[PDB]
Design a protein around this ligand. Sequence first.
Ligand SMILES: *[C@@H]1O[C@H](CO)[C@@H](O)[C@H](O)[C@H]1NC(C)=O
Lengths: 50, 48
Amino acid sequence: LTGTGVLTESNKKFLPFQQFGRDIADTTDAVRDPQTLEILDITPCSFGGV
Amino acid sequence: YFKIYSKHTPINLVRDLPQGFSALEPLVDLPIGINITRFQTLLALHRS
Ligand SMILES: *[C@@H]1O[C@H](CO)[C@@H](O)[C@H](O)[C@H]1NC(C)=O
């Protein structure tokens, strides 16, 4: 699973089976890292109009 | 793939299915790859 964003700590109580998370657009918003099983939130890098 | 979903609920109702809602979490996924059209419930006898 590929993408770009800032990985931050999260407070989303994922259930054991649950691995990743998806928004309305279906783009991944959170992911569970292998090897360490922790839950990383994926926040898109800052952008806007010039 | 044999998908088993499970949910365990403490109840105190006597005879029938309780009326309510409980979403079943996935328990196990088994790669059995076999044809299934018939099934059996397994019970346990009590002897004295
Ligand atoms: C390797 O990944 C597994 C999960 O697939 C995990 O249980 C285990 O702790 C990991 N080992 C190390 C050394 O990170």
